[PDB]
Design a protein around this ligand. Structure first.
Ligand code: HEM
Ligand SMILES: [Ca+2]
Ligand SMILES: [Ca+2]
Length: 315
């Protein structure tokens, strides 16, 4: 199909996304930058989608975190999410797509701004949300590995798929974990979708980048980085450690698995056979140019190797 402005897309129904794409690149992502707004929007895709439990309800990736923001932003695991919900809401009001479609579309567009990034498959047509997420369905950085895996598994993700989705922490920072140092990133390259997150979480903890007493926070290996206790444990737990290490210096796997697993997450509560594929509207991401590395001055002896089957790669 050819849209009114001449841009093309496989299905014609997708044409309505082009003006929306232009508006968000300019007015949500500050000129298509891989910065805080993109990171916030990616976090939002998960906080929307994970509100899905076979036994309790919730419609998964349904826009409920916006439609029922009064409720969902009261949940403690949603701290800080009000900021991005309030930023996205006017876009949903102005354009003619559901909040559930918008949240996933904005997340996919955002990721495409980041070097190393992928185009997450995107489907159009989610109905408006009809119920708020149940309470207590979002994992916290102070939850055990068993608790996190049980929650994610309840929503349909295997332990390896949890590791794949956590590639998101390669373009990510924390504001609430330690409020004395807001915007401290989870890896040394928060504006690059790369394997540095999987590398740097494997390093021995050395210090706290801000204050020392924060719930859900582990020692960081670097002054300019923060570490979640959940990522600390996941990198080391027999259930996840080998898959974690397998992502290191393995950008093709990070790309493939993140795109596929993000699509699955984006479709929680939905049926792709009743939606329209509009994946080709997402921009083409830049590629990486620099190689994966330990931080300068660090060596293998600084790595806490946790995979009995396979030694940590020599970087
Ligand atoms: C698996 C369990 C997870 C836990 C325990 C967890 C925990 C956290 C925490 C504590 C923060 C920082 C919030 C703050 O203090 O500002 C954060 C940020 C973030 N999360 Fe995760 N998360 C998990 C999974 C995911 C998944 C599956 C995604 C995929 C979209 C994701 C995407 C992000 C992003 C992109 C940020 C950075 C937000 C920003 O810089 O504004 N997280 N996460
Ligand atoms: Ca939801
Ligand atoms: Ca990174």
């Amino acid at each position: 199909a050819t849209c009114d402005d001449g841009r093309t897309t496989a299905n014609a129904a997708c044409c309505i996304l082009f003006p929306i794409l232009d508006d968000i690149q300019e007015n949500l992502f500050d000129g298509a930058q891989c910065g805080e707004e993109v990171h916030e929007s990616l976090r939002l895709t998960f906080h929307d989608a994970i509100g899905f439990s076979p036994t309790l309800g919730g419609g998964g990736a349904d826009g409920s975190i916006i439609a029922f923001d009064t409720i969902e932003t009261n949940f403690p695991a949603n701290a800080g999410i009000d900021e991005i919900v309030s930023a996205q809401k006017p876009f949903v009001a102005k354009h003619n797509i559901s909040a559930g479609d918008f949240i996933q579309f904005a997340g996919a567009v955002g990721v495409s701004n980041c070097p190393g990034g992928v185009r997450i498959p995107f489907f159009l047509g989610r109905p408006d949300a009809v119920a708020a997420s149940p309470d207590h369905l979002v994992p916290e950085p102070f939850d055990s590995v068993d608790s996190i895996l049980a929650r994610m598994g309840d929503a349909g993700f295997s332990p390896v798929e949890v590791v794949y989705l956590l590639a998101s922490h390669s373009i990510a920072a924390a504001d609430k974990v330690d409020p004395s140092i807001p915007g401290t990133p989870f890896d040394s390259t928060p504006g690059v979708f790369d394997s540095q997150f999987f590398i740097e979480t494997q390093l021995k903890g050395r210090l706290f980048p801000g204050t020392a007493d924060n719930k859900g926070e582990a020692q960081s290996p670097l002054q300019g980085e923060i570490r979640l206790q959940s990522d600390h444990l996941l990198a080391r737990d027999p259930q996840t450690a080998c898959e974690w290490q397998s992502m290191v210096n393995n950008q093709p796997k990070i790309q493939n698995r993140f795109a596929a697993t993000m699509s699955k997450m984006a479709l929680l509560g939905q049926d792709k056979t009743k939606l329209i594929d509009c994946s080709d509207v997402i921009p083409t991401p830049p590629a990486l140019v620099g190689a994966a590395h330990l931080p300068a001055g660090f060596s293998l002896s600084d790595v806490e190797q946790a995979c009995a089957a396979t030694p940590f790669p020599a970087l």
